[PDB]
Design a protein around this ligand. Sequence first.
Ligand SMILES: CCCCCCCC/C=C/CCCCCCCC(=O)O[C@@H](COC(=O)CCCCCCCCCCCCCCC)COP(=O)([O-])OCC[N+](C)(C)C
Ligand SMILES: CCCCCCCC/C=C/CCCCCCCC(=O)O[C@@H](COC(=O)CCCCCCCCCCCCCCC)COP(=O)([O-])OCC[N+](C)(C)C
Ligand SMILES: CCCCCCCC/C=C/CCCCCCCC(=O)O[C@@H](COC(=O)CCCCCCCCCCCCCCC)COP(=O)([O-])OCC[N+](C)(C)C
Ligand SMILES: CCCCCCCC/C=C/CCCCCCCC(=O)O[C@@H](COC(=O)CCCCCCCCCCCCCCC)COP(=O)([O-])OCC[N+](C)(C)C
Ligand SMILES: CCCCCCCC/C=C\CCCCCCCC(=O)O[C@@H](COC(=O)CCCCCCCCCCCCCCC)COP(=O)([O-])OCC[N+](C)(C)C
Ligand SMILES: *[C@@H]1O[C@H](CO)[C@@H](O[C@@H]2O[C@H](CO)[C@@H](O[C@@H]3O[C@H](CO)[C@@H](O)[C@H](O[C@@H]4O[C@H](CO)[C@@H](O)[C@H](O)[C@@H]4O)[C@@H]3O)[C@H](O)[C@H]2NC(C)=O)[C@H](O)[C@H]1NC(C)=O
Ligand SMILES: O=S1(=O)NCN(C2CC2)c2ccc(F)cc21
Ligand SMILES: C=C(C)[C@H]1CN[C@H](C(=O)O)[C@H]1CC(=O)O
Ligand SMILES: C=C(C)[C@H]1CN[C@H](C(=O)O)[C@H]1CC(=O)O
Ligand SMILES: *[C@@H]1O[C@H](CO)[C@@H](O)[C@H](O)[C@H]1NC(C)=O
Lengths: 51, 319, 152, 50
Amino acid sequence: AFLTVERMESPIDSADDLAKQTKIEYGAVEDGATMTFFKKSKISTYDKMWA
Amino acid sequence: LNPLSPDIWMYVLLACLGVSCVLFVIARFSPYEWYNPHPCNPDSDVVENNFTLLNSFWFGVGALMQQGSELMPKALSTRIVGGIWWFFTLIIISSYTANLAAFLTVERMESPIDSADDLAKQTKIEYGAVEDGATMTFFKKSKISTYDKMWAFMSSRRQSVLVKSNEEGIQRVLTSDYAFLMESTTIEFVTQRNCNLTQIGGLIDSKGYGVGTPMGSPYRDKITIAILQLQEEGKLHMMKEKWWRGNGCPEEESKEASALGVQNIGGIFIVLAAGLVLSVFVAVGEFLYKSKKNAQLEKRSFCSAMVEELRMSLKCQRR
Amino acid sequence: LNPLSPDIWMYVLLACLGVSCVLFVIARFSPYEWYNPHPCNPDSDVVENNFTLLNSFWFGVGALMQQGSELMPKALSTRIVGGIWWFFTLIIISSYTANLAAFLTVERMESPIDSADDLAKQTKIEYGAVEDGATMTFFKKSKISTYDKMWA
Amino acid sequence: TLLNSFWFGVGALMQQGSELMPKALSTRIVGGIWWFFTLIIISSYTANLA
Ligand SMILES: CCCCCCCC/C=C/CCCCCCCC(=O)O[C@@H](COC(=O)CCCCCCCCCCCCCCC)COP(=O)([O-])OCC[N+](C)(C)C
Ligand SMILES: CCCCCCCC/C=C/CCCCCCCC(=O)O[C@@H](COC(=O)CCCCCCCCCCCCCCC)COP(=O)([O-])OCC[N+](C)(C)C
Ligand SMILES: CCCCCCCC/C=C/CCCCCCCC(=O)O[C@@H](COC(=O)CCCCCCCCCCCCCCC)COP(=O)([O-])OCC[N+](C)(C)C
Ligand SMILES: CCCCCCCC/C=C/CCCCCCCC(=O)O[C@@H](COC(=O)CCCCCCCCCCCCCCC)COP(=O)([O-])OCC[N+](C)(C)C
Ligand SMILES: CCCCCCCC/C=C\CCCCCCCC(=O)O[C@@H](COC(=O)CCCCCCCCCCCCCCC)COP(=O)([O-])OCC[N+](C)(C)C
Ligand SMILES: *[C@@H]1O[C@H](CO)[C@@H](O[C@@H]2O[C@H](CO)[C@@H](O[C@@H]3O[C@H](CO)[C@@H](O)[C@H](O[C@@H]4O[C@H](CO)[C@@H](O)[C@H](O)[C@@H]4O)[C@@H]3O)[C@H](O)[C@H]2NC(C)=O)[C@H](O)[C@H]1NC(C)=O
Ligand SMILES: O=S1(=O)NCN(C2CC2)c2ccc(F)cc21
Ligand SMILES: C=C(C)[C@H]1CN[C@H](C(=O)O)[C@H]1CC(=O)O
Ligand SMILES: C=C(C)[C@H]1CN[C@H](C(=O)O)[C@H]1CC(=O)O
Ligand SMILES: *[C@@H]1O[C@H](CO)[C@@H](O)[C@H](O)[C@H]1NC(C)=O
């Protein structure tokens, strides 16, 4: 069991993994096209990411 | 032979030559190992050690395969050598047989080609694209080294390797030995629903689709903004998800199976049969060297050999 | 009996009767195996070989099942048969007990579908409903694009 | 004896062999088929113990 575990897996592997886990905080740049993507999205995974 | 790295298989083979050396050294000048022979003795003047160099290396090989040898050390200085070699061979085997669960599965080949570099240097796999597309025309106008070699090939054989549709290409990958050079998006569909086809390589260039308008038409700019409108809403991702996803060919895991055969294990019977043929040769070596030791008392080579040969034929000689 | 295929169980038994006869021939052909079975008795030139054919099988059977036998090779020509049969049966036992772990812990039998989108992709198992019920009327008005394919 | 016959059954069960091995082929088949028993019982034990 100790020889076959895994390297170290990140607690997130996607965007909805970081949408649920509110321990690691989001980021973007002020007035870029990244925050402008979430400001106009309504896909309800990315809506929480702007919430 | 993989669950230990090829320096570990050398370091445990030097450890057998190392410990059987230091067991042979200690057993000679430890004065408590020199025991008494003759179990019906007039109480002595004879001391005989049972650690030769032949028996010290039989202890290192004996205590390595967990089948113990005929001799165990006396004389505590030679028991600590035997006591710490046993903890060595315990950990080497318990690390071997606990890692062997993963390395005991065969795995698929890599393809003979793995890019457009590997596929330009070969002649066995024929290759071509759809004639008069944007893929043939890319190699027709290219000048870079690899992608001009791949058009020197196609222009020599433009009746045989250049199919005239994608469906004539996908069937010829199937029904022949052939590598067909598509666009990246059609391969993302075909390799889903079909499960014998894969995308060998990375993207050669990068180019995109587009609603074509006549040169001067104002519907250029009104669809330019409109295509951007579906993208940030996520409709272009939603429509592509609906069609390019199908039966995923999920058969990669597929544990479910694999009784070991002569494919997996397969090779101990080679190193068994190479060990016995080795042992027949050193049975000749003992047959001659003892007869040449008997030739230190009498005739040259033949008379001492044939007497030992004839007693072996009776199978029950017992002088 | 499963973690080795039924040919390998017939190559072990043909090696266990193979090596145990090669050990018997070499042990009576080697002159170093013949010893005087009287250490404390200087009586005469009596020689004795421990390797009869029934003791030679017992080394190949005793070392195949990890238990070890009463006799042990003494000449170098028979320590190489005995030394390589130990390495044979070290790896056969280690390959058996490492694949026997895999056959005891697989799963019962899993269905190829576990959801609706699993049966939306897999078009091998065919759909069903009742004509003019509220089941087909649910898919006829849905547009959720998982259930839209299920009416497609 | 009966003390030594049961020490062979307990000896050959924990894989540490006993001081006596049988002669007389009829008593070697008993020892030869008890060894295959205790091989499969332990190799099923230590492969399920994970
Ligand atoms: C089941 C088999 C039984 C075997 C037998 C019983 C075995 C008894 C064994 C007991 C070990 C006790 C130590 C606790 C182990 C926990 C970890 C530890 O502390 O290791 C530490 C060192 O410790 C050593 O190096 C120990 C060396 C053990 C040698 C035993 C030889 C006896 C052989 C018999 C002699 C024959 C004499 C014969 C006489 C006639 C290192 O710790 P670490 O991991 O590096 O942590 C740091 C991690 N970090 C680097 C990330 C910061
Ligand atoms: C294809 C190749 C074929 C070769 C064919 C030609 C080979 C020809 C053969 C040559 C040698 C055999 C005949 C001469 C020696 C006689 C044997 C003997 O026991 O005597 C001496 C050897 O004692 C030693 O020194 C043993 C050498 C080290 C043992 C480990 C060797 C490597 C194991 C192999 C793995 C490596 C793998 C290698 C790569 C694969 C000492 O014993 P003694 O003192 O005489 O005892 C008398 C007993 N008495 C006193 C009670 C009377
Ligand atoms: C413990 C210390 C001893 C160490 C010795 C051993 C170290 C040796 C390490 C060698 C490492 C070499 C590395 C590379 C080799 C490449 C060759 C190769 O391809 O594989 C070759 C196999 O190889 C054999 O068959 C060797 C068998 C060894 C038998 C000797 C046992 C000695 C027992 C000692 C008893 C001690 C008792 C004590 C005595 C007192 C050929 O394979 P192939 O080409 O695939 O042919 C198959 C045909 N086919 C192609 C159709 C499938
Ligand atoms: C690694 C350890 C090596 C051990 C040693 C070598 C072991 C050699 C073993 C060889 C077995 C060869 C059979 C092939 C196995 C494949 C399956 C099979 O056929 O089994 C079949 C029966 O078969 C038996 O019952 C075999 C009984 C084996 C007894 C061996 C004792 C030897 C001990 C030594 C003697 C001491 C003498 C001492 C003298 C001094 C049943 O098949 P099934 O699964 O029921 O399929 C039906 C499935 N269905 C019901 C779903 C429809
Ligand atoms: C001597 C008599 C004759 C023997 C003959 C036969 C013996 C043949 C023996 C060996 C043969 C083959 C040798 C190869 C492996 C050995 C060394 C090695 O590399 O291991 C380690 C050395 O890495 C270290 O941590 C160094 C620590 C040294 C401690 C003292 C060593 C001496 C012990 C005496 C203490 C006396 C106290 C007790 C006194 C009672 C690991 O190497 P690494 O690559 O660095 O690790 C990976 C690095 N990583 C962690 C970043 C991932
Ligand atoms: C494992 O991989 C092998 C290596 O590619 C592969 O072998 C090839 O198999 C195909 C057929 O599947 C062989 O095609 C033949 O070539 C002629 C043209 O010269 C074909 O017309 C012909 O029949 C075709 O095969 C179709 C099946 O794919 C069949 O429905 C049609 O009738 C069609 O006409 C021949 O069959 C090709 O030469 C083989 N290559 C080599 C190097 O042997 C194996 O099929 C593959 N096995 C599996 C199970 O996937
Ligand atoms: O043909 S394009 O319009 N211009 C070139 N490129 C980028 C250079 C890769 C791309 C990249 C992605 C496209 F979808 C289109 C184009
Ligand atoms: C550095 C900045 C603010 C720019 C750079 N490219 C993006 C842009 O120009 O839209 C921004 C990065 C982002 O969106 O995180
Ligand atoms: C038997 C039938 C057709 C009826 C029964 N209840 C549902 C109904 O009355 O709506 C239907 C079942 C279904 O939807 O599969
Ligand atoms: C892949 O292998 C052969 C070649 O076509 C065929 O028998 C098999 O059914 C194929 N599998 C699929 C999923 O097409």
